[PDB]
Write a structure and sequence with these properties.
Bound molecules: adenosine-5'-diphosphate
Shape of chain A: elongated
Structural class of chain A: mainly alpha
Binding site for ADP 4 (chain B): 292, 331
Domain AAA+ ATPase (chain B): 53-326
Number of strands of chain B: 19
Largest sheet of chain B: 8 strands, mixed
Main location (chain B): nucleus
Catalytic activity (chain B): ATP + H2O = ADP + phosphate + H(+)
Chains: A mainly alpha (120), B alpha/beta (439), C alpha/beta (459)
Largest interface: B-C, 105 and 85 residues
Oligomer: part of a larger assembly
Shape of chain B: globular
Binding site for ADP 3 (chain B): 292
CATH class of the domain at 342-421 in chain B: Mainly Alpha
Structural class of chain B: alpha/beta
Helix content of chain A: 40-55%
Chain lengths: 120, 439, 459, 438, 449
Amino acid sequence: LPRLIWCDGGRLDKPGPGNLVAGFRSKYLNHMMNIWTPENIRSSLEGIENFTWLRFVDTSLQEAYRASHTDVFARAVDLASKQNRLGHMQIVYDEPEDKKWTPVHALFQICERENPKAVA
Amino acid sequence: GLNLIAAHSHIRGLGVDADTLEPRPSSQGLVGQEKARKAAAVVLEMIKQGKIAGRAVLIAGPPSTGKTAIAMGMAQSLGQDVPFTTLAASEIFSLEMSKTEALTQAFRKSIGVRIKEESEIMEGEVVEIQIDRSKQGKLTIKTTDMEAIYDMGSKMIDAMTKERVMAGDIISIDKSSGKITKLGRSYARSRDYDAMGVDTKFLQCPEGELQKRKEVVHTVSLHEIDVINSRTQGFLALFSGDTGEIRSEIRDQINTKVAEWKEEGKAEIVPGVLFIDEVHMLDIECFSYINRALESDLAPIVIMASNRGVSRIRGTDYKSPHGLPLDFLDRVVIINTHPYTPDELRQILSIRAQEEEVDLTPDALALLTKIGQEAGLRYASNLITTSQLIAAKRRAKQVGVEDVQRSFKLFYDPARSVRFVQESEKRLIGNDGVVDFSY
Amino acid sequence: ISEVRGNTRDHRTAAHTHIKGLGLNSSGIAEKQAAGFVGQCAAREACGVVVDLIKAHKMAGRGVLLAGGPGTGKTALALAISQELGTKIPFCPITGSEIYSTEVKKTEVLMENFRRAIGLRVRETKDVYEGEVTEMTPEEAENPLGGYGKTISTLLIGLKSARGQKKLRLDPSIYEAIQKERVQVGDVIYIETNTGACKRVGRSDAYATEFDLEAEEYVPIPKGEVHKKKEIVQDVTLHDLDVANARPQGGQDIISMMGQLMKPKMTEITDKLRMEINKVVQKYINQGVAELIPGVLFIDEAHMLDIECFTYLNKALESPIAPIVVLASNRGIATIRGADDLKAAHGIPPDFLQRLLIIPTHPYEPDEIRRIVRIRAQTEGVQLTDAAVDRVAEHGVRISLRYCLQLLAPASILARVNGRTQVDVQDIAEAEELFLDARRSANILTSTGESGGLHGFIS
Amino acid sequence: HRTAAHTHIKGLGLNSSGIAEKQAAGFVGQCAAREACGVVVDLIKAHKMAGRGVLLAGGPGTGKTALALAISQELGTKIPFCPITGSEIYSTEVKKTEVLMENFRRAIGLRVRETKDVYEGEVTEMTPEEASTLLIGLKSARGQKKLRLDPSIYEAIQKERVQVGDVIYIETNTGACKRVGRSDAYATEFDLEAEEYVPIPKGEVHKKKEIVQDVTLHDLDVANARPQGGQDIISMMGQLMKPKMTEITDKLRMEINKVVQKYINQGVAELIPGVLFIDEAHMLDIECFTYLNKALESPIAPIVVLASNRGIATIRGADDLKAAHGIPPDFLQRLLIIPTHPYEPDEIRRIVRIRAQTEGVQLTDAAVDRVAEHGVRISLRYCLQLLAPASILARVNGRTQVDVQDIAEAEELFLDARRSANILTSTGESGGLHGFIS
Amino acid sequence: HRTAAHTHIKGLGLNSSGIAEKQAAGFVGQCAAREACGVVVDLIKAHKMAGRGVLLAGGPGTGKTALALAISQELGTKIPFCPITGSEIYSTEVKKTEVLMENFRRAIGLRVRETKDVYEGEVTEMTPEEAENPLGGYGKTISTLLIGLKSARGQKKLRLDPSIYEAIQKERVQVGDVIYIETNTGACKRVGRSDAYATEFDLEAEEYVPIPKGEVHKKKEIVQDVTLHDLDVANARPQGGQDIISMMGQLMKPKMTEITDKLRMEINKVVQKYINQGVAELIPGVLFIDEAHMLDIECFTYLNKALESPIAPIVVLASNRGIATIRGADDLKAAHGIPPDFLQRLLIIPTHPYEPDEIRRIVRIRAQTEGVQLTDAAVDRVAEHGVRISLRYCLQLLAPASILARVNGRTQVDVQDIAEAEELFLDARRSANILTSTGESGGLHGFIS
Ligand SMILES: Nc1ncnc2c1ncn2[C@@H]1O[C@H](COP(=O)(O)OP(=O)(O)O)[C@@H](O)[C@H]1O
Ligand SMILES: Nc1ncnc2c1ncn2[C@@H]1O[C@H](COP(=O)(O)OP(=O)(O)O)[C@@H](O)[C@H]1O
Ligand SMILES: Nc1ncnc2c1ncn2[C@@H]1O[C@H](COP(=O)(O)OP(=O)(O)O)[C@@H](O)[C@H]1O
Ligand SMILES: Nc1ncnc2c1ncn2[C@@H]1O[C@H](COP(=O)(O)OP(=O)(O)O)[C@@H](O)[C@H]1O
């Protein structure tokens, strides 16, 4: 390939002289006008607004923003650094008086909090 | 803004005397159709009470008789208190999933789970961080109005390091999670640098107290809880789609858990409406699923509209009324809309002319009302905005008769277009592909 | 945190909410009106034997057909079976429409639902120590190893639950888990005796005030005994064992982890997995540690199955571990969905029809309709005058059972918006005019849609 | 420049009153249809109306696609014009309604103005100044400048392999940076190194430029649905990792509307609703038209221009239903319909002259008359195709202009479909050795 | 050992003059067709013409498939013979014209000499050296590995590239292992423990292997047989490097892809260079499309392009159909079920139905091949069924009758055993009469129609 195509702005995503679109579009579509940035999510976090569920899915605004922007390999590495603590609660919070206790910030994480595997 | 003037923008509610459900002849944008509007108001009372599960209501009638207008009016007067999922029947034909799977989703979008929550959240601009790498440390953080020093635990210092927190960052700490979010930088720090990273955002500093605590009400559909549980970060699929055919033992387990949340008062269930517009585009396999789906304790009320006469049911070769199986119609009560009278047309044209802010002369509205009687409501409605643009080329203040007349000659109504096709039989391409390009 | 809703917790009502059972004597004879049923006495008696067949667990892959016109109570009878069996017996209802997955061949979908309908009950003992960690304390060994700075012979852990305190004299090797799990004093943990390891549940909320900011979720102290030994009963369908084997869940590698982050498509599981599962399941049944619970697969609108589905069910029903399959159909003489030149009764292929016990459901007499109206009214909580019961039942006879039942909720509203708690003929006469039936609406299509040029129906 | 079929059409050729000139901007005739298209232009430029539908209807070769392209140019480049054929809707990758929905949003534009603050120079210094903030010194032939760097753009500069003596480009507002090379003042550090030596920038080291940037609502959808570009490196494996189109949910499109409105209120972004043109609209099936009923009723929706050349024809996907234009009658009620009529002999002569002088072909007037006869008797579209061959034939005969002999020679070399149909008839007498396969 | 339908066919049975011996190499008759198939064999061995088509046209059971199998044996194992049915073209993963091209390129062989340039030895020492990446975020990285390899004859210390060290990590190498490092790929293979550590007292079944003889560094010459399709596939879904794409390509599900003509023309140039370098020779072969009537109008249209390719193989089609409808072209009927257009490209070898005495002779060849002894009355009786019913039918009786004979203790099949086989095992037409006679009545005992 000629460097005009492969290096000097024949690739649309890579910014440089002779690709003035790419640097703008990178900032605005991934940060400014991006629904997943924490400043945008926090405006919609309530009521019947579109991120209302976020309160209960066991993830932070920072983590929601990370998962929207990193690819499935990078996310899978981050997932290595995590613990099946909702599965351990199934071992521990067990009696009727424990009332199947679940962290309210993990309330919608239903199938993780109860499945046969952890008990087995 | 983004909300430009659309076809149903004038419909602001159902227009009924709420204590008695009697439709007022013209109010909230709806005109006429009192029998249909009263039946729609009774359906609202079933919806708002929520005790009745899985009624199906079909709104039937000729084209341009308010079947969508009435369903939009119900959405406007039901209010965001209750889910109102609007499904075009064409959308059920997914490649990502089964037809019945796509319907199972649309049914569950229409049932809300409502939770009321106290969240305790600290947000402020970071003044400084101190660490005793002798672990412990102190965070100094401010609003415009308050400032404090906080003792940080070691795990908090680790998380602060991982988030690369520095002075001038706006951060939030969720006390329940114990998790930091870097929200951005204060506008006061805009002068720190000559070049900024792509990911950086400026904010106003937080304001009021630091450790705000708020009563929040959350309304979440059963479909959202499905998609969240479908896979490890399924909440991403809420936006991209990409759910697949969510396995039923997930849905059964979610339904069981939501029943506990109601029993314990942790949540309330908010049944809503699914409106399936142009339902005759569903096929025989769809209707068979919907038969069983309506018979469920967590079914919404389903409303649907059709304009078909006796017509072939899709997925078979016999005809039936409305295009629907008689087996299905046995579960449905039917609301019929009717054609409008000339005086009801005159009002609807006035309502539309107001929304588009067009000043019709009385004679323009008269002529335009005749056109709507002769050529259909939508056609006359389309000539309102057209005549405005033609009058503006005259720099005229009001739409005159001549502007409606010129709009009429330039734009053919359907009946005049169908005539034009017949007179052009051999120059247009027929159903057998033959055409003659010669003069 | 969550604000509890304290006011009311009443049930919704749906088309079958009145059906409570088959309504049969101890002799199995049907009572003319019981458990919400009216009539169908012969069909209820036959379904009563079906319940006894299922509950006896003797037989595999028997087929039943419910046959009869629309509205004749076929799905009501299926729901009554599910209630007679109770929630311990698996009950997997589908329509024939649900088989046409886009992800897998429709015979896999049919076999999935087929093995959802088979339950397995496994009894095991759970045996764990639990608490917040009150203390961790090494004991030096009496014979320390040469060249090593410390030799530890025991690692004492104090565990506190809400109900007691215990000093666990653990084997020293648990140091591995404590380091890797980062167990502190005050963290809630369990130790499982089948491994001797430990897992960290979290930090006890007794310490939630240690700092102004900490990245901890705080968890309550366990409200059980400090030592929890008990038997636990696990209920799984054999489909759960299929998926647990074909899509293993716990994998630590990059490919497993990318897997669990992507759309989890179902896959056309092999007969040799299912057969290998069956053979090991049968081992544990013979050991007596598991018991098989054959349930019911109910296929509604079974006329929507095509001939490829039916020819597979032939094979499936012959397998030794199979549910009872209940079909329901209403299609008279009809074309088989996949064989456009074969017409048969019920729309069921004659080859397959020979397998089924067939139960007919007949139409309802006018007096049965009237009894159902009252049962349905008292289920929706509507109060009627007796003249209103008669007028409603007249629509049931003249038009449809379903139609007349559906007017009760509209009429209830029109009554109360006139200040009346009891619905009367004047309200029924308004419900029936706001809400047409299929036939009166079809008459409008014939009359107003007599032409289509404008203001006519699209046809 | 190249010459496509419509390159002579510059615009609708309307007067200030909106009356069509009998011949202007490359059109001949269609005055009624051009005037009606002029009103559609006003509807588009008066930003206030969503979801108005238009139909162009008339025979093949009567100028429907010329009229849609004339609208596009009267509308200028600012406003989105999104042309598709009804045939493009049949993706194998998402349902037809998603393909229509994506094209609805490609027609709605959002204009932003950035002041791009560009620094480009040889790196003179890279000194840390924080516990991490740098000072970068940049040099050009005209001076030096030092920039305090945000810790994150510093990492961007560090992921590029920038060192002292390199030439770099920086967008200090967007946070983009590029290594252009190593400055050729260092070209003799060694006699061989695998390095790209470039001259020091001769201009000002800092440049400020006004850029008007256009995106569409669909670009926002795509960007919010999935990690894009260099964020999604694993996409290189293909198979499951390919950036497939997905069935974007309304929940996503509603969040994008909300976030976009925020930036409109702040005046950062300017909304620009445009046109979706669906040519060959009769190729849409009954399920597509059903969705277009709903889709045109959202309050953000472009103006949709259909074209059809069908008479009474079966609706695709609904064999029982026949209607005019091949458009189901339910949907035809919504549309403003413009008829396009057949051209007359003298109008054809005029279109021929316009096409000749657009292709640069010079004709004798006898050649004009002979070509125009073929438009009357065969097809306008067949006239115009003959001009380019006849120009070649003329020049190899050494002539400076096309004449009757070159037209007559071109006619014989290049048959129309009517004469070739006569050949198919006379030769297709049998499946024998010389027969066409029937 | 196992005997199939064609186990007696050994070749075309031709003279050096190219004339069919009336019974040779397992054949009886088909002499004109065997002679034509001889000329096809010689067209292939000449390896000079691309893209010539042959139709074996003739009724079912007339030996069309036997002849194609005989061609394969006359060509021998050097030449690619690629047999398919038309039913195999209908992949779900890729378009039907893709599997045509794959099979066209499986029919073209290449023999190539390859130099493996390789290191071997017992690993004596192994020591990593590291880079202090400041701001990559992934932490430190190993910059090289130093490894000591010892053979019987000599020793080296290698400073390996990081991507070759990753290969050693994948191979779980330790000090004292014997390893192989192919520098072509950068792949590493662990051969075993050195025999110097040979001890019973390890729980795992280690391969204790002797120290490599010769130098640590070697060059091996290997002659490889590949097809063009193997090269296409290798380069479409790469797996040979130690880069990250190759690494992950070994973990993802195998998947066919619609390999572009750009890749195929590029691989022609690669192979042309091996030819010009003298390391390779082209071995163009033959694609046999059995059941070619099961192709469709899109396949046949594609062959009109594909057979024009200047390296296309020889294509042999078999069809058993008279005037029949072309699939996917339901209005068009033509002889053989082949479009008239594409039929003009082929040389048609018609095959003919057998005479009673040829059938009798086939029965003996086939009986000898299955290893079963018949009386002449038995051979005559079976031959009668070959005449009256079908050759295939009469040959199917030999195996049943042998068992039935052995069951009575007689080792030789006689007429009573065939007489029993006839009644246990019906032909298609006796079964079709049972259908029709019973099909007079429905009810419980009717056949389902
Ligand atoms: N009763 C009504 N009051 C006000 N506007 C109406 C009424 N009925 C129809 N319209 C308007 O006329 C147009 C066509 O009616 P609509 O209900 O959308 O058609 P359909 O009857 O085919 O569903 C829409 O713009 C709609 O808002
Ligand atoms: N014997 C009965 N007693 C009480 N209610 C019945 C009876 N049969 C039917 N119903 C009710 O009438 C309606 C029609 O019955 P359903 O089971 O839906 O008919 P089918 O399944 O045959 O279409 C349902 O609402 C059902 O609950
Ligand atoms: N009124 C006109 N004046 C000049 N050129 C025209 C006119 N109408 C059509 N053309 C040209 O003639 C050709 C045929 O018209 P086109 O618009 O493609 O037909 P269709 O209506 O079938 O799409 C095109 O090259 C177009 O540019
Ligand atoms: N000339 C022959 N000599 C010996 N065996 C033959 C001959 N022709 C056919 N057969 C055998 O008879 C059977 C039918 O021939 P086959 O090639 O399968 O027919 P088709 O043309 O249908 O492929 C095969 O077992 C084959 O080996």
